Design an enzyme around this catalytic site. Structure first.
Site, PDB file in Angstrom:
ATOM      1  CG  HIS A 135      -0.495  -4.148   2.283  1.00  0.00           C
ATOM      2  ND1 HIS A 135       0.206  -3.246   3.053  1.00  0.00           N
ATOM      3  CD2 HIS A 135      -1.675  -3.556   1.988  1.00  0.00           C
ATOM      4  CE1 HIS A 135      -0.519  -2.153   3.212  1.00  0.00           C
ATOM      5  NE2 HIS A 135      -1.664  -2.314   2.575  1.00  0.00           N
ATOM      6  CG  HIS A 177      -5.733   0.975   4.886  1.00  0.00           C
ATOM      7  ND1 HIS A 177      -4.554   1.154   5.578  1.00  0.00           N
ATOM      8  CD2 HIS A 177      -5.433   0.173   3.835  1.00  0.00           C
ATOM      9  CE1 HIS A 177      -3.585   0.488   4.976  1.00  0.00           C
ATOM     10  NE2 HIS A 177      -4.090  -0.118   3.917  1.00  0.00           N
ATOM     11  CG  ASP A 233      -2.171   1.218  -5.366  1.00  0.00           C
ATOM     12  OD1 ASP A 233      -1.839   0.708  -4.271  1.00  0.00           O
ATOM     13  OD2 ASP A 233      -1.484   2.080  -5.955  1.00  0.00           O
ATOM     14  NE  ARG A 240      -0.215  -1.637   7.094  1.00  0.00           N
ATOM     15  CZ  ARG A 240       0.830  -2.133   6.437  1.00  0.00           C
ATOM     16  NH1 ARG A 240       1.020  -3.444   6.361  1.00  0.00           N
ATOM     17  NH2 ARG A 240       1.686  -1.310   5.846  1.00  0.00           N
ATOM     18  CG  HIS A 244      -1.044   4.937  -3.440  1.00  0.00           C
ATOM     19  ND1 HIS A 244      -1.485   3.645  -3.257  1.00  0.00           N
ATOM     20  CD2 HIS A 244      -2.086   5.738  -3.124  1.00  0.00           C
ATOM     21  CE1 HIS A 244      -2.742   3.664  -2.853  1.00  0.00           C
ATOM     22  NE2 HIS A 244      -3.131   4.922  -2.764  1.00  0.00           N
ATOM     23  CG  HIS A 276      -4.340  -0.437  -0.607  1.00  0.00           C
ATOM     24  ND1 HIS A 276      -4.308  -0.040   0.711  1.00  0.00           N
ATOM     25  CD2 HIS A 276      -4.769   0.636  -1.312  1.00  0.00           C
ATOM     26  CE1 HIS A 276      -4.703   1.216   0.801  1.00  0.00           C
ATOM     27  NE2 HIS A 276      -4.988   1.651  -0.413  1.00  0.00           N
ATOM     28  CG  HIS A 292       1.517   0.985  -5.338  1.00  0.00           C
ATOM     29  ND1 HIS A 292       1.156   1.665  -4.197  1.00  0.00           N
ATOM     30  CD2 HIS A 292       2.709   1.497  -5.725  1.00  0.00           C
ATOM     31  CE1 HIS A 292       2.094   2.548  -3.902  1.00  0.00           C
ATOM     32  NE2 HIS A 292       3.045   2.466  -4.814  1.00  0.00           N
ATOM     33  CG  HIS A 334       0.044  -0.026  -0.861  1.00  0.00           C
ATOM     34  ND1 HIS A 334      -0.580   1.121  -1.299  1.00  0.00           N
ATOM     35  CD2 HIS A 334      -0.255  -0.136   0.457  1.00  0.00           C
ATOM     36  CE1 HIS A 334      -1.227   1.680  -0.293  1.00  0.00           C
ATOM     37  NE2 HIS A 334      -1.046   0.937   0.784  1.00  0.00           N
TER      38      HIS A 334
HETATM   39 CU   LIG Z   1      -3.266  -1.012   2.297  1.00  0.00          CU
HETATM   40 ZN   LIG Z   2      -0.489   1.863  -3.336  1.00  0.00          ZN
END
Ligand SMILES: [Cu+]
Ligand SMILES: [Zn+2]
Ligand SMILES: [Cu+]
Ligand SMILES: [Zn+2]
Lengths: 153, 153
Positions: B48, B120, B83, B143, B71, B46, B80, B63
């Protein structure tokens, strides 16, 4: 955004965090922070065109120059948008930054968001050198540390 | 402008480069590159909110979510802006990324320039998990690597 930050890192001991804040869309930009691991003395300090760190600081490209001007000091009418002059380190290798600039911005054509902040090995001659290179880079030498300018708030 | 890039680095072996390209003003964004050092399988991917690397990848914040939605997965209407679902690492832990997305953008209020791209530890459950966290972070976990999204040549 009204606040961005760049975390400078390189192959060597040079490192630091630099903050930028601009309260108004067409207002000045305050720049402050510290850098360590530097040799005592002056060091070039500018925003480079590309926020590309694929190859260390060299991939950041030339000085940010959307208006296609010649290199200069931050107070010179003629200058690249990214020309922020020099920062000064003390005997211990620390340089405290406290700048206010009206050319760089966090929006529009002069936006430095997503570009790279670079600190050089040698001093920037502000573009007054008797050579063409001075009008391009200021003869500040190699890039010791750099960081992509990102949104912080 | 139309091309940006992100260099993913972390405290571990996970590292990579991801390119983004948006040919037309508000058109789709082509996202591609490669990531290595990952375990075999899905991995949350994603954009951020902050391009703040002052505390590694943790300072990147949540995010990117300008429209304040929940999400989800990239194909969901409810998700998001940041996303981008999951990337898949092969048996050798290399994830060849290649996707298009029309929610994220390189300009406007949905612009991801100066923000952070994160990879992630675990898979993003796209908001279908049986818990509250699922509609918050998709339970993607820690992360592993990140990088501020910057302007490329
Ligand atoms: Cu993320
Ligand atoms: Zn998200
Ligand atoms: Cu420079
Ligand atoms: Zn310059």
């Amino acid at each position: 955004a009204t606040k961005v930050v760049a975390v400078l890192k390189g192959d060597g001991p040079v490192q630091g965090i630099i903050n930028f804040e601009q309260k108004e869309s067409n207002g000045p930009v305050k720049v402050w922070g510290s850098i360590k691991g530097l040799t005592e003395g002056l060091h070039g300090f500018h925003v480079h065109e590309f926020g590309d760190n694929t190859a260390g600081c060299t991939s950041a490209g030339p000085h940010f120059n959307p208006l296609s001007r010649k290199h200069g000091g931050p107070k010179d009418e003629e200058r690249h948008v990214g020309d922020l002059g020099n920062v000064t380190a003390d005997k211990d290798g620390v340089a405290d930054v406290s700048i206010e600039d009206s050319v760089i911005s966090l929006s529009g054509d002069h936006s430095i968001i997503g570009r790279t902040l670079v600190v050089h090995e040698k001093a920037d001659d502000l573009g007054k050198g008797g050579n063409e290179e001075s009008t391009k880079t200021g003869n500040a030498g190699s890039r010791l540390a750099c960081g992509v300018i990102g949104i912080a708030q």
